[model samples]
Target: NAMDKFLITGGVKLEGEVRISGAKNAALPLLAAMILADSPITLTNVPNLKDVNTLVKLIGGLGVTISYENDTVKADTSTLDNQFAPYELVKTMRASILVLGPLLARYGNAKVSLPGGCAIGSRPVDQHLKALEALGAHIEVENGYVHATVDGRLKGGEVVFDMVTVGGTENILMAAALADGVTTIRNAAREPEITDLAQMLIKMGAKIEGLDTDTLVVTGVESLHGCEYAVVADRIETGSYLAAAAITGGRVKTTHTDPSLLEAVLDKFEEMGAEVTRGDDWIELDMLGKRPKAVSFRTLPHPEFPTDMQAQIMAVNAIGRGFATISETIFENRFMHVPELSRMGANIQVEGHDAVVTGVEKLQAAPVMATDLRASFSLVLAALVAEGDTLIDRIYHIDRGYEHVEEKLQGLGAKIKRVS
Candidate 1:
């Protein structure tokens, strides 16, 4: 029938080494940031996911020549021609809008369509527009498109974010890197991806003063030359695997390009009775022979537990001992996974913006649909800990994020096989 689903038999103890892939969120913006370069830029450790392929197509259509070979993506933006990102390409990923900044900075004008991706929240692009306007770009919303045109090259100015928005801060950072004069971004995002972009910009001749701080000062240069940069490891993916280990009472030595990015998530895992052994480039989580205790969590911005890892952790909490609380401050309707988890005999109660997860003994497998990308994985974790068979439909949502997820789980002795 060509329909895809994951078959995972429960009660399997995972034991092995799981090397995490590159961060999807980090790769997307870095791909869009390629438009800032004057020569070819190469990115290594790039995951071969559908979203990455989509951006390669979108950016290539805009005249940034791109090639992917063996998990390495090479992009040449020396002669970027178009300033328009059409709906067809932008419809699959919200981060497609990230092209507006680089396109406008390099070409003096841009018209990018409004974006679409996960259905979790109404993540607005207004902040992105607001920051660009602060940099002296004229913006107008017409016909489902954001029109950005500068008089000449952008004139750098101070941008103060109304809130700590990751996308807003990222958009301004790219635009300010090529603007005239010095630009100071106040209340900026402190996510690892932001720091990753700043590092790449510095490599490409951008003068950025802050590396992991709230405020950033960027001295705009006339142009940026190409430089090879690698995307950071996927902290969310790392966290998801840790939760999976906890769910199955397994053990794993997880590799990390940088462990500090996931320090907060690691602390939470240990509090739930998972023994964590530290290392320079790797950390091992052993939950075998240990009954995971329920742990409460709140999803904040960087330096805190991320909103993306909430669903997976909640799935683990469902089967943990005692009760746990979850307060999702990042997204309004992020608890969409709660109802789906409840389908598998979980005692999850949603009270407005909070989720109270009462740990159940076990989850019985059932047919569940994935509402969003992160939520889809929550179901997979549930199925792993659950008894019998769980058929997750709309697996294409899962495909957009994880790379060969079933295979990775199977590699660790999990009884998971993909069906078509």
Candidate 2:
């Protein structure tokens, strides 16, 4: 059997350089949008992981020719036999639902299984359904599948999101790109991933405006052609590494990611006394000998403290110099890590959606389970600062998002090894 646990020795000060991988969240939607063009598109810097590979197989089943190799993916979406995304592939990843927009846009029909519950929160696909409906696609639900159809080509229309939804915005943006007229998205999610997707679509000849705003305008093009594109760096992955450095009282230089990608998060770390150095394409952090000061933040939409970095910051604050209050306004159930950290001898209390952390001089190690993607890495961060060995199981969750996370840490001088 493959290894399912991480055996880690704590209190190792991670040093040296860590290279960031391409963003998985950015790759999923870009991979799905392949169905929009009939020519071959080459994507460089594509991260290899379970979710990206799973999504590759899911789309390949649609008759799109996609093969991943050497951190590059060559996609020939020119021909497809099926517009229906099966339950077997879609069940494991909510990102499989991303195929719905492009499939319907190209074939005038899409039948996709509803992505079931995830560990973080409910994150219903209702927003996706409603946005597609707004684009004149007739939508219906049956047997746990979303059935949608358009009339050859979608007629551009108005879609106003009730709240900020990244998936909803990306889905509608791809669908609207091939529609007949101008389509406007109100209250759109302004994530860098969304902007990266837009840039790729633009390279493929989709007209777009408002890449970094709450509102977006997409003027439909007659057809899309293939173009080579590169994905954005993983901000969440970069943030996790930065937290790892801070928690271990180490220094690290990260490459292949934009320093501006995490303006809010980097600022928060600066407030915690980590010395930050930035260049056009590099960010280095020195957290040696300085205990981070506890600082508070609320999880909001992008350009704010990302909810994805929530657990990691909590881990840092638990061993910092004062009390820190964190309110999780994005996902109601994101505090699943609270109890797991508490078991590790950290002082933490959760009241509804808020968590208060009282800093302890040190943390004691305990065997922990990987809760979710982001939550799992929080355990990794805590384990680095804890006093003993940490046995973290269910690392398949970690593999879904981060590429070579254990290996990356090992290169940074962490005493971590994947074991049976």
Candidate 3:
């Protein structure tokens, strides 16, 4: 078997209409949470991405029966047999650790491998372990494996996190759903994905309150009944397409998107002189012949700009007339796209938390490598308007987030293709 790679030939204006897929981040945890419920859980509008396939393999390995038709998945975990996540799978995706809490709560034990480092920051699972410990689960780490065990069942308590971590909040929330008493998690991450997971849990007949807030209260339920749920739209993917339209000086309409989840990004786009409109389940961006102004932004947790969209926005600001500063607060070492953008004639320099970008009049296309997910999208945005062909390699990172990226861009009039 070969390590899947992509060769993208870019240099075309992306216009017209494209449909966004269901969220990758939201679907992963929602799949993991199905183990906490007793009946068949059906997920609709699921994205057909590599990460989703990885999670499906993981859930199937746990003895869950997974059946898929089109974009809907029905998973029955009533006969699960294993709770250990193999290293071959867990190291590929850090989000695989999300299953640990559900496994511990449902089976009282789990042994999962620790996720390795990536081009992003050092995403540690310490916060996840600490939060689980607050709910009376004993956890240990040795030889890159996390061994967790609960005594018969978990007893809920107060978990106050030292920092706002999205993974930690999700892991603890799933674990507390079946605990003995009420579980209160203070300083919880208020990301849209977290709220979406909480909403799905509520649909599964779990008593949960305070979604979209800093505090989550989950009362213990003896058992959860399964329900059919639809994954939320990928807001990051929607924003990436919006950036594509603005960067290429074209008009684009993105369908099947939840516009309310993208207020911060749209507001920034409006500030940068792009015209945006919202309709039922769609977003339209008209940027033909419009000059995008330089804008400065800092990445924060939910209700603020997302760190995942920082790289693409930086690319958007790179070819404008003035200078812009981009600060990445969530993930260290996330500026892997800086060098790639520089290869395409982008004037960008990174100094600690800040990236100072001087907008160039025009960018000449060149070869670039995508070091991570968002980095690939940034390269695509830069390539859309470049003078010559831009080649982007290592696009497996992009498949982890955006679904049918090349096809969507092609439908939008971009001269982009995947060469395997």
Candidate 4:
């Protein structure tokens, strides 16, 4: 078994350019979408992350011919056999539940294990099951697996989500692609990853409308053909680096990502008195050793500040000029980094979903443990500017989302490393 650990020597300024990889959140659903195609679907710009490798094993176990070369994945479901996603794999990563849609769509039945909650909030599959049921699938929760079977073939209907959910919208979208009639998904999550998945589905010949809105209308197709699609650059990763630059008083440029997707984040950064420059496929962050002004933000569904970047932004705000408050609307327990940041001499207080951060002149490094993926990045953001060496445990959480994170930060002249 691999033990999760990371050792960091802090107080080094990060200054340079780093190219961002494809979004991990986008790759899972796109990989699941391969099951809808009769032929092999080629996915380019896939991030080389631990979660992607885990999903590859899960998908390969289902009898899909998975081939990889460089940054691309070729998945052929022509000989796909299994419909049930094993509990062992789903337990490791919650995104494993995404396979339920393609499995049920292609085989008319599927048994996927329930993904339990992590250090974040409640990992609810209720919306996923409810949306599938709306599309004429008989779903039942027995033991620890979700047993679902459709009567004859699936027939599309309206799926209106009570709350905006990213995974729920993805599961419903993929299932509706192979249904009998039009399937409308209202109040859907408008995350960039959702639109990226929608774009890939369109390339596979699925008729979908409202790509950039909350209501998505998907028309069922008889069958989808294999097509080549590229995943979008990771916005959360880009935001994390921007936060790092702000905290360390350095300059960083993130390439290979569309800057428009970061409009809301950039707006907030500008409000904090940071110099931001946006190009066609890159965003530059220049923090000239000045303490950032206090800025408050609330997380909302896409086109707004992302919940994934909330913790890291709060880490930056912890050492800013004045007090800053962050309202986390997406997940309840996402403020796990507050305690870790406080350990590093940060003046921070957590009150329910909101975190109140009072600016501190400096942070002293101390041994810390990462509670989750985004939380680990928050610790790193603070650790980069801490006085002494910071040892971060549970690095596996960070590996799940970031590809070559240490190398990316090293390229920007940050002293970070991994030791077993």
* Model 1, C-alpha of 366: deviation from truth (Å): 0.9
The residue ranges of model 4 lying beyond 4 angstroms of the native Cα positions read none
lDDT tens per residue, model 3, 200-252: 88888778888989999999787888999999999999999999888877888
Candidates by lDDT, descending order? 2, 4, 3, 1
**What TM-score, over all chains together, does every model reach?**
0.97, 0.98, 0.97, 0.98
Which segments of model 2 are wrong by more than 4 Å? 1-3
lDDT, each prediction: 0.87, 0.90, 0.87, 0.88
| Cα lDDT of model 1 by residue, 1-77, tens digit | 12677777877878887888999988888888888989889999889888899888888898778898878999887
lDDT of 1 at 7: 73
What TM-score does candidate 1 get on C-alpha atoms? 0.97
Error of 1 at 82 (Å): 0.5
Q: Summarize candidate 4's per-residue lDDT along 47-67 as a digit string, tens digits.
A: 988889889889999988998
Compared with the true structure, model 3 gives a TM-score of 0.97
Worst 10 contiguous positions by lDDT, candidate 2: 1-10
